[PDB]
């Protein structure tokens, strides 16, 4: 079995604990509810370990989760399509991964969630534009859908393989 | 806004 530590990071409300737990639960939250995750799956042949740290922006102090994010393998990138402002934001959340990993090169994936919305406003064409400046896939989901979820995830797997031996 | 620190990704506001 080889083990996969991905970290789930984007701006406020994007949908980072519903891309989670629907990953792992296969449940859509659609309450509001403001942890850390695992499931066993096979990959391209590999059985492996998905282990996925569900960040945010208020959480309390923890130097155990401080730990888990430095040793975080890959990075999914999330904002919403309908909230420009999360994708405005998604900068911020690259230059943090590479402080946070103090490299350079970090595998990463970027996601736009709540496909599933008809009031979007952040165009395929911007986030495939901000993913290729970066050199990183860009991947559309629905945490309620289900649409992409396990693409996202495994492709963040994919990019770890790229990147390093597993 | 920004993040508070360079370990996690608590954030403050700018506002
Ligand atoms: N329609 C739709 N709603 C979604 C989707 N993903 C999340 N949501 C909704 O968006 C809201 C926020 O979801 P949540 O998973 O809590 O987002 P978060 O990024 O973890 N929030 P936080 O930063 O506070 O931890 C919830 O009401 C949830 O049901 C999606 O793909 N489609
Ligand atoms: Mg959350």
New interface residues.
């Given amino acids: 079995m080889t083990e996969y530590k991905l970290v789930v990071?984007g701006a406020?409300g994007v949908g980072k604990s519903a891309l989670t737990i629907q990953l792992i639960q296969n449940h859509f939250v659609d309450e509001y509810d403001p942890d850390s995750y695992r499931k066993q799956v096979v990959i391209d042949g590999e059985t492996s370990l998905l282990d996925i740290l569900d960040?945010?922006?208020?959480?309390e102090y923890s130097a155990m989760?401080?730990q888990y994010?430095?040793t975080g393998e890959g990075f999914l990138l999330v904002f919403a399509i309908n909230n420009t402002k999360s994708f405005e934001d998604i900068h911020?959340?690259r230059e943090?991964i590479k402080?946070?990993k103090d490299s350079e090169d970090v595998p990463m994936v970027l996601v736009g969630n709540k496909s599933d919305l008809p009031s979007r406003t952040v165009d395929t064409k911007q986030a495939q534009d901000l993913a290729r400046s970066y050199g990183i896939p860009f991947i559309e989901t629905s945490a309620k859908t289900r649409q992409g979820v396990d693409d996202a995830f495994y492709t963040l797997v994919r990019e770890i393989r790229k990147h390093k031996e597993k | 806004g920004x993040?508070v620190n360079?370990?996690?990704?608590?954030?403050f506001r700018c506002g």
Avoid: I, K, L, P
């Avoid at chain 2, 360079?6 to 954030?11: K, P, V």
């Fill in positions: 990071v406020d960040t945010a922006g208020q959480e989760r401080d994010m430095r911020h959340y943090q402080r946070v | 993040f360079f370990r996690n990704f608590r954030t």
